């Protein structure tokens, strides 16, 4: 997955480490990434690796109610998780669609 | 004070008399399930050093699922 590693690097590692590259390019820094492929192909593996190497906090959002108490006692909107993410910026919010 | 770890337990281990009378021979035709349970439960208990030497990580838990009965 060297090509995938480079592709996810240019979008998640560069904006965190070097926002000046995107500012000089005059383009908005990427904020959303999609990884699509058959199950077991390493999407979660690459997401965790890119979160680990850039020192970005890795948050997995499975929508499970068991963890809701940690997200917030409100739990009325999923954006209530952002308060946690902002507290651990840079952050990578990861969600895997089981389908 | 510090109480002994085995003390203060509302749940008790199975005594000799509480052991069920069901044998492996009593169960018919679950060789695959028997092998998986043995390799994941009873074999790591007696052969943990072998698992370490080979490089296998023994499974901490086993979830047995299927239709009732």
């Amino acid at each position: 997955l060297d090509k995938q590693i480079k592709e996810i690097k240019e979008v998640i590692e560069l904006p965190v480490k070097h926002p000046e590259l995107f500012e000089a390019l005059g383009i908005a820094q990427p904020k959303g990434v999609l990884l699509y492929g058959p199950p077991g192909t390493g999407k979660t593996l690459l997401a965790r690796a890119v979160a680990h190497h850039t020192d970005c906090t890795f948050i997995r959002v499975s929508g499970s109610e068991l963890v809701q108490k940690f997200i917030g006692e409100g739990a009325r909107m999923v954006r209530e998780l952002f308060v946690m993410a902002r507290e651990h910026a840079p952050s990578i919010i990861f969600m895997d669609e089981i389908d | 004070d510090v109480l002994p770890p085995e003390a203060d337990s509302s749940i008790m281990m199975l005594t000799s008399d509480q052991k069920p009378d069901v044998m492996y021979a009593d169960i018919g035709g679950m060789d695959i399930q028997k092998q998986e349970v043995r390799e994941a439960v009873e074999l790591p208990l007696t052969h943990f050093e072998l698992y370490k030497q080979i490089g296998i990580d023994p499974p901490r838990g086993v979830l047995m699922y299927g239709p009732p009965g």
């Binding site: 690097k9 590692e13 560069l14 070097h18 190497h53 850039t54 | 990580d57």
Partner: protein, 386 residues
């Protein structure tokens, strides 16, 4: 067929260390082939600091043109690596930064710049995120330590590699570390641990950057015949499938092993002389070639005296194919050292075996090692008081 490609990077090339040791020997200082191979390696790798060290220690004539060309190549490559690192730290990510430093450290190690290589490897390790990459850097440090026989470096990096392998369950790296540790134990006369590690990795050997598999098996046999009991030697080495398969291509080593095992003592002595001449030229076994061989001789003597109540001196001499006087001198020397449990009746020339209890042999070692530890404690307290 892809065997050597499996091994770790060949930096530093331990063949260079072996050839340097060969040139250090008085017998082989003038060997044109050894000098030619070492110079070819130096020229190919542009080892300017190693060329300086070679011409300083061995008192050679430094080729000014060759030295200048190699130094210019080193300077240009170092400038290129510095430019790559500078580009990485500003534009590329942390992984590319670590790759650039790894390239710089590999080049420094390749040209023999030991101290610079150690500094660069420490810097690369400090911001290396992958555990396996860190362990590869530790193996690089271990190879550098083995290249210069740096005991402190080897011990520190062995402990670090053990910790890293414990953290991440890398059994391949565990086998490689076992091979490296066995090589070091060979270097420091720890033949028991070297034999144990070599036998553990006789069927998983992939460290072709250290030695060829045939050389590894020869070393394994050599340490096993000195560190293993007869049942262990039979079970692990004599009946070992991999060892026998390799020995099919090494008639001399198989003869040396089986002559001892099959009690062909004259054949064993001839093979021991051949093995001694082999150890003298090996940079790993050179400090111990006098020791090892002597021990082997004792083993042979002990074996011939283990099953018999008494043996005539003539019978021993005939069995070993030597003179009676030689057997007398050797047995007297080894009994005086306390290594053979027998006494010689020179009047009738009969060696009568003894069976001293293991309690005496444990008590003597207890006295010796307790005295060593007591001296350490005393000198430590002496340091503490002032």
């Amino acid at each position: 067929e892809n065997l050597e490609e499996e091994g770790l990077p060949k930096n530093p090339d331990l063949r260079i260390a072996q050839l340097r040791f060969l040139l250090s020997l008085p017998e082989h200082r003038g060997d044109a082939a050894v000098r030619d191979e070492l110079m070819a390696a130096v020229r190919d790798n542009n080892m300017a600091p190693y060329y300086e060290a070679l011409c300083k220690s061995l008192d050679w004539q430094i080729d000014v043109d060759l030295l200048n060309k190699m130094k210019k190549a080193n300077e240009d490559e170092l400038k290129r690596l510095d430019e790559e690192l500078e580009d990485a730290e500003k534009n590329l990510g942390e992984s590319e930064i670590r790759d650039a430093m790894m390239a710089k450290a590999e080049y420094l190690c390749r040209i023999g710049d030991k101290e610079g290589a150690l500094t660069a490897f420490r810097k690369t390790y400090d911001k290396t995120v992958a555990l396996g990459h860190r362990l590869d850097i530790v193996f690089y440090l271990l190879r550098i330590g083995l290249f210069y026989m740096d005991n402190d470096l080897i011990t520190r990096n062995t402990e670090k590699a053990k910790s890293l392998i414990e953290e991440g369950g890398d059994w391949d790296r565990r086998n490689r570390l076992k091979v490296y540790q066995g090589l070091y134990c060979v270097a420091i006369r720890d033949f028991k641990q070297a034999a144990e590690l070599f036998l553990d990795t006789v069927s998983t050997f992939t460290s072709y950057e250290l030695m060829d598999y045939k050389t590894f098996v020869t070393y394994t046999v050599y340490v096993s015949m000195i560190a293993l009991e007869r049942p262990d030697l039979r079970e692990k080495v004599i009946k070992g499938a991999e060892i026998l398969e390799v020995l099919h291509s090494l008639p001399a080593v198989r003869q040396y092993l089986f002559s001892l095992y099959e009690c062909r003592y004259s054949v064993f002595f001839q093979s021991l002389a051949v093995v001694e001449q082999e150890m003298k030229k090996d940079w790993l076994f050179a400090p111990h070639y006098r020791y090892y061989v002597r021990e082997m001789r004792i083993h042979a003597y002990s074996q011939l005296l283990e099953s018999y109540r008494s043996l005539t001196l003539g019978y021993m001499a005939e069995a070993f194919g030597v003179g009676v006087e030689f057997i007398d001198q050797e047995l007297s020397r080894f009994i005086a050292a306390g290594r053979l449990h027998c006494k010689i009746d020179k009047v009738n020339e009969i060696v009568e075996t003894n069976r001293p209890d293991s309690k005496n042999w444990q008590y003597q070692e207890t006295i010796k090692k307790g005295d060593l530890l007591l001296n350490r404690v005393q000198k430590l307290s002496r340091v503490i008081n002032m």
